[PDB]
């Protein structure tokens, strides 16, 4: 899973656009 | 003029360039003629 996970890739906010986070951690 | 505030949400107004925000320390140095520091998505965030 670790091999995995490290293979796969503000300023957003500042119009708007948040990001709701997940609720599966 | 007026004074120079930092670190609380305040309205500035920099050569003619408004916006409202945090004026937080910077870390980051310019090339000593450019005014403006901008991110990929060609929003203003820094300033001289």
């Given at each position: 899973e ?8 503000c ?15 | 003029?007026?004074?120079?505030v ?9 050569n ?33």
């Open positions: 670790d091999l995995l996970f490290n293979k796969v890739t300023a957003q906010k500042f119009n708007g656009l948040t990001v709701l986070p997940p609720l599966l951690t | 003029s007026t004074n120079l930092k670190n609380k949400c305040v309205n500035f107004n920099f003619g360039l408004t916006g409202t925000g945090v004026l937080t320390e910077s870390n980051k140095k310019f090339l000593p003629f450019q005014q403006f520091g901008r991110d990929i998505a060609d929003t203003t965030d820094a300033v001289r």
